Design a binder for this molecule. Structure first.
Ligand code: MAN
Lengths: 42, 300, 88, 248, 248, 300, 42, 248, 300, 42, 88, 88
């Protein structure tokens, strides 16, 4: 009933909302992996 | 003699916004880099051979994060101003200082600006914007641009004022430790994200066996009033079921081995596919159609 | 692929392997030998593990932030996949 | 409807997002800024604003790294927000358009690479400009390589406006439910491509065991991503100290 | 009842299970097979097949390793099947026989070692047979030295058929509830012996800390056995690479 | 000269079924190994002393997994045919190639066939049999035997066609790495099984304190109808006790220390007892009786 | 009311059945430890 | 009320508690022993025993380490017991006395530190006695220092008994809820200072990773503290075995 | 000659209880140490110069756990008896053996007596005392005093009889390893205790979003009798919120990052302030007042 | 309603009691901390 | 323990300790000293840790898969507990 | 603080830094140098990390359980925080 679109926002059939918890984890998870991979790239 | 003024440094500042202007794949940012250098090289050299010598030089392979190139831009302008007035610099130090800087400044630039600063600012603007707030976009354009012009301008002056006397003290004794330690975190943290952030779930059910007496609650003998709820929580607390059927799905069968097992298989398969010279635009376009078919066949 | 590219790559790799300083970078030799070998077969090496460019910086920093002509002209001899998806 | 001032005004923003989609400097192609500009110039402001807020969340982590190009949020924002205005359904159609932003985001990824490949021809022209020392010749052709990235988004926008509100509402009503549902499922699998090319750049027989532990430790749901990273730093700190003593 | 055609056929199947119980080649001693043949000849087929399916699960991991002998599934299969046939209660008596199949599986462990010890003396006869180069004296005793392994199973079966359907029904009704209940609890304490033998062969001061972590990591229910294995190998890979640096 | 035909190789294969025929503890599989070699040695050596020399030779200590003995069987047949025709091999290579092969091939045979192949076939076949399905036992005999005869026959011929040219490249540089890495996993994985697969569960209760007000759900003031359940789960969710008594059993007191504490003691005690020259049939029989007593006194 | 007999089969007083999940976990642990038991032996 | 025999006995028990606060040999200064003695000499025995058990549970881990000294359980116990007897409310004032103990424990810590700082003059006079070789002055001044360490708590007890049951009952009834609540919360934050001091005594660049691993592993609530200690020992032993190879 | 009788040893025993009599911070336990040795210094030396020499010697810095000083007492008594009877021991072995013994015995005594046996005896006594049994404090005093007196007397006798022949086999090649393993274990366990025993919890609420249909159970359509509880439990198990409001507190916002983040912050701040020469009494009083205020401000 | 004073005993407004599990955990953690600190301090 | 077995074991291990090749494997030399002593004490060694047999393979493989007579005749000197329970 | 204490600490550090056996102890050399420096600035060193006394024990044990006069008289030259809270 709720199609996942990532970063805390899935959708509904008439309204889409962002989940703060999943938004906060995505804001952090990308930071950790982005920093490491960017460093491992050099 | 051929000193570079404050004015020409600002025109170099304005043109650096186009540092990604051409962006071919052969030499990525040569056009934007060479375009940025014209206001200096116009005055630095005046012969046709000398103007040709500079333009052939800076058309070579250059690529980095466009904000972190300003310290390169200062040191490059430091070298050519010294070169124009007389200094034995010839095609080895001009490229060498640049190439020593494009790589490592990108790997410190890509995390800071792309995957850390942008999402932190982006979330604030989005959270406001989703709430019908016009102040969302206005902050985002202000925040990102106020941050950007301060760093891109100030450090460009710093690269010019410091010469190439900051690149000598950049020995790679630390650098062979930083990337190697980075890989340990990365392979670790991507491991955790693969188990988590790769959405692969299977819907279809396998077995729907019928439970015996003593397994399910059997909502027929429950007491009526202030004691029916009592025995409902305690029987569940002992492991009794809310229906007379145990429903088992393929996801549990995979999950019984290890969680995220189907995500790893896709993750390994993508690893195998790219090594096999498959353009990721085909794989991702394929990865969308797979979601179309497997959802149609009631699989995902 | 393009016949003017392959011969010049074979020129630059053959030039790079004789400079005394590049051979010391044994890691760089592996890249050049494969790059020459693929160029020896009219094919351009596929750098899906983006290793060649980081090494050229590692060697350059190891050589007092100085680089010769053959390594610079070989920087455009690589493919480097170009279809990012992100971290999300 | 859209009068002649608006149909051109949407083109001006549409071209600039393509202009800014490669420059990455003033950030007009961001969903929160791009969608906001289309809604302002068309009169349907708030529905475009919230879509921009909604889409900016999905497009948080899209950033070009090296030769890799992010899923072209300039097309996903500009072209999706136009169908949001032409198709009607201001606040009800925020959901409808968002569903087709991501496939459009992919559709831009195809077009950016085709443009980024034609930019090879210009530098071949531009290399001659280095052989004669012409400062004018390099400037003019650079404006071309900058203009072409803009029309890379204005051309799709031209047809979506050429295909007016008549057939646009028909397509948004003739949409099967499953075409929506499976596209969302495919969208949540695409991040497996990005990890693999990142893992391929980092995986070695030395660090493969560190992948397995982090994968298995992700099965304990009481741990957070920060906590998993703290475990990630600590093994890296311990491994390096144990390895320098051993090697020397 | 069992006729004279069955009693010969019953012992022979039991004899072959003892014959195969040491050969470990054609796998007639396995519960799915061995139970099935007793049920096939006695006419009570399906109750024996279900017992064979039930008992095979309890005996999935019983395999001789080196000098160590598995708990003799040949006796447990034969004795339970005849218990199930003689005493009646085809499907109702699936449980009752299974309760006594495990203890008799131990009773054959006693018997198999006494047999595997008298098999020493034959080779002492055989050592001198090598001192004369007698090929036939070698073959004859090996046929003999195989026969008593079948006998080890056919003799209790001969006594179990000697104790006819009368007393076997009496004992299966004279089984106290606690005699059943405690034996299962003892059954789940057996694997402490098998682990102890394996841990003794492997434990050193260098690997004792790896035991403790694996024990403690077993206390998080979200980890499965496969996940715990991946963690174990990842330390094993890391430990080998780290100790090779230090030693050389 | 003294060549061995295809037919004689088959009888050696047919005879290897009895490779465990004698199974004395002094020499484990010598009788079955020596019996397996009769059709070859009869066709190889004709003197009485030569037959005695072969028979004294192969009566010595031999043990391994009976399926992976065929590559030894072939290499043994490779050496004997070379030896019978004339080759300076003197009782040092004959036992040497065998003893070099019995050990390590068991450590690969025992996992592959006993603890991996046998139960995977067994668990699949049992699942049918428990359902009253005759397809169960028939498949199990077919599955295990079809796997067996091809493997034991094919590798017998490979050992003969490869001789002592396989063990030469079997150096101990790798063998030491495997076992030590094996021990890290083994001590780890037996650690996890000990915490789980060893059942030492204690029944008796210790403390039964009577809870005060605000601790339990108090099923007297609960609302009646569509609001009684709501406040039941909310009182449940905040930790209020489903009964007015808190029961603390012996297992809790050990579990509050660490899970699986009573299991670690037993296996270590079995470790200690087995070190103390106690035959495990005494330990296991004693363990069964312990279960009888500790259940009688309501301890387990 | 149900006494454990290992590999997913416990029993009842008149009928015994298999726990598939614990049957699966039994094969996993037997496989992993058995591989290391033979390997550490040699 | 309290008569002259009772007040003298109370005072001497308080003095002995002050002696044992630093003597740490007979441990009269413990909450159970001290509260028991005070209740016995005041006639209100059982409330004092219960209170002393409660504080001993509170004060299990208070032990002076090196120069670091615990918050003086002797004064806390003595003052809580005297509050409990004078204020009335035998079993009702248990909670109030327990609440008042902790800040009184901190006050006793301050008093004992002041006394230990004043003891330097005594140590210097003993240095002079060593310069003149007199045993008697050493003994006299040691007795004198023991006497002041006893009076360090006999004095607050004397002043509290000087303030009659009236005003102490008034202060017990004039206690705002928030004062006690915030005092409990502040007492629940104290151990941060001690942990920080121990870490400062132990923290190095080689051990901060292990701090992080342990801290993050503490978030899996199924793991017990014994299990966490086992994990820590296992990591320590693996690290030492690897680093010994690393050194050579 | 100047042999020490049993009486003087018993007097040293009795005087050792006052080993902490002075307890200044400059020289820690020199007062009680010298006081315990007064009978020895009396009975050994009789000249005015020699008594002054011994007293000046024994007023120097001494500290350890007062119970485990008895072996030091014995070794010191043996050394001084040797010095009195004639032995080239000159102020270097007395102090040397003393200071060698102070450290490790304190580090082995602080765990055994303070943090291992004292709290268990105290917990037993406290449970007994709160249970209304007077036997608590009696058992505590009896047990602790018996343990102390026996340990002190026996250890003194051993230290006297053993001479200085125990510390010679006390090489420092292993104390480094013990300390390093101790530091690893202690840092791990202190991280765990920081996460689990320091409670810094925030009360105030942040977000109270109003949920749509399908999110909460909506106790209006629930069935009435023997099925309402069923549907309530199924909707609870599927994750539907038990109320039409979702409560998000600042503690949840911090916990989404990592548990114990505020506790770690306070731990770091205490480390930093202690490094910055802040007396821990001031820090703890300030912590109490901080708790007072933050509870007044409804924060904690 | 219950004020944590640590080591198992919290309180109530008229009664204080010890949580035995928390007393056990505190005693074990104190044992570990004291042992490790005493071993490291030397 | 048999009297002919004890003397034979004392005979075989004795000749094993004098071969140059068996001496080099220090693992086996520690083993064989144990084999003599309990044979010297008229008892048969109880290696509940199955160490002796794997070492014979370890030594044999190190000697180009060659074995002498003394190690082979000692293969039956072990007890090797024989009452397996399984892994379940 | 105390001027006599500062002067005596300076003298004792000075004579400690001249004994060969103490000179060998680099870990103790660090503490002695730092303590002499702080005495040179008329301040008494504060060690929240109680490092000096365990180091004097380590050195004494490394010197056959023998100690000189300067380390003994400097044993009282440190502050060593004194407001324990506990482990709880
Ligand atoms: O540090 C060990 C030791 O130091 C000081 O002397 C006192 O606090 C003792 O109680 C403690 O045992």
């Amino acid at each position: 009933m709720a199609r996942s679109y990532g970063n805390g926002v899935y959708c509904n059939n008439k309204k889409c909302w962002v989940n703060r918890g999943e938004a906060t984890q995505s804001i952090i998870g990308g930071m950790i992996s982005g920093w490491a991979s960017g460093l491992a790239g050099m | 003699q051929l000193k570079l003024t404050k004015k020409d440094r600002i025109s170099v500042w304005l043109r650096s916004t186009f540092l990604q202007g051409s962006w071919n794949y052969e030499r990525m940012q040569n056009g934007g880099w060479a375009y940025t250098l014209i206001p200096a090289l116009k005055k630095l050299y005046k012969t046709k051979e000398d103007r040709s010598a500079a333009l052939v030089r800076h058309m070579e392979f250059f690529n980095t994060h466009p904000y972190v190139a300003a310290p390169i831009l200062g040191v490059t302008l430091a070298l050519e101003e010294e070169r124009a007035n007389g200094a034995p610099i010839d095609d080895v130090t001009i490229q060498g200082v640049k190439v020593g800087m494009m790589g490592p400044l990108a790997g410190i630039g890509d995390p800071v600006f792309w995957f850390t600063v942008k999402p932190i600012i982006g979330a604030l603007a989005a959270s406001l914007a989703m709430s019908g707030n016009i102040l969302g976009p206005i902050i985002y354009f202000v925040a990102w641009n106020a941050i950007r012009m301060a760093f891109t301008w100030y450090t460009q002056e710093f690269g010019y004022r410091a010469g190439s006397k900051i690149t000598e003290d950049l020995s790679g004794g630390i650098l062979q430790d930083i990337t190697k330690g980075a890989s340990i975190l990365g392979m670790f943290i991507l491991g955790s994200l693969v188990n988590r952030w790769v959405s692969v779930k299977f819907t279809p059910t396998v077995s729907s066996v019928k439970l015996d007496k003593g397994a399910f609650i059997d909502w027929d003998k429950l007491p009526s009033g202030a004691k029916g709820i009592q025995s409902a929580l305690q029987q569940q607390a002992q492991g009794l079921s809310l229906t007379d059927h145990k429903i088992t799905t393929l996801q549990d069968n995979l999950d019984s081995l290890i969680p995220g097992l189907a995500a790893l298989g896709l993750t390994l398969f993508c690893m195998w596919l790219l090594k096999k010279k498959v353009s990721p635009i085909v794989i991702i376009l394929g990865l969308f159609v797979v979601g179309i078919v497997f959802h149609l066949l009631h699989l995902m | 692929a393009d016949y003017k590219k392959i011969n010049s790559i074979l020129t630059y790799t053959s030039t790079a392997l004789k400079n005394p300083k590049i051979i010391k970078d044994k890691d760089l030799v592996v890249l050049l030998t494969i790059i020459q070998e693929e160029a020896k077969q009219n094919r351009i090496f596929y750098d899906y593990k983006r290793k060649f460019r980081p090494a050229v910086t590692r060697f350059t920093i190891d050589n007092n932030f100085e680089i010769p002509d053959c390594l610079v002209k070989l920087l455009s001899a690589v493919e480097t996949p170009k279809a990012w998806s992100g971290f999300s | 409807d859209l009068n002649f001032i608006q149909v051109i005004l949407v083109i001006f923003v549409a071209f600039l997002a393509g202009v800014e989609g490669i420059l990455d400097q003033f950030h007009f192609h961001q969903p929160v800024i791009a969608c906001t500009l289309i809604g302002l110039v068309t009169g349907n402001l708030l529905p475009c604003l919230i879509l921009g807020g909604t889409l900016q969340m999905i497009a948080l982590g899209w950033a070009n790294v090296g030769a890799a190009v992010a899923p072209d949020a300039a097309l996903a924002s500009i072209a999706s927000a136009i169908i949001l205005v032409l198709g009607g359904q201001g606040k009800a159609g925020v959901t409808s358009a968002i569903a087709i932003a991501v496939p459009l985001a992919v559709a831009g990824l195809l077009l950016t690479i085709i443009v980024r490949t034609l930019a090879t021809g210009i530098v071949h022209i531009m290399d001659a400009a280095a052989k004669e020392g012409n400062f004018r010749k390099i400037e003019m052709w650079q404006y071309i390589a900058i203009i072409m990235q803009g029309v890379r988004i204005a051309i799709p926008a031209g047809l979506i406006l050429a295909i007016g509100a008549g057939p646009v509402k028909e397509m948004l009503t003739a949409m099967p439910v499953w075409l929506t549902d499976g596209l969302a499922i495919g969208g949540g699998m695409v991040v497996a491509v990005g990890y693999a090319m990142v893992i391929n750049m980092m995986a070695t027989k030395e660090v493969w065991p560190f992948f397995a532990i982090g994968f298995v430790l992700a099965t304990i749901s009481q741990l957070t991503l920060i906590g998993l990273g703290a475990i990630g730093i600590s093994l890296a700190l311990i491994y390096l100290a144990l390895s320098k003593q051993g090697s020397g």
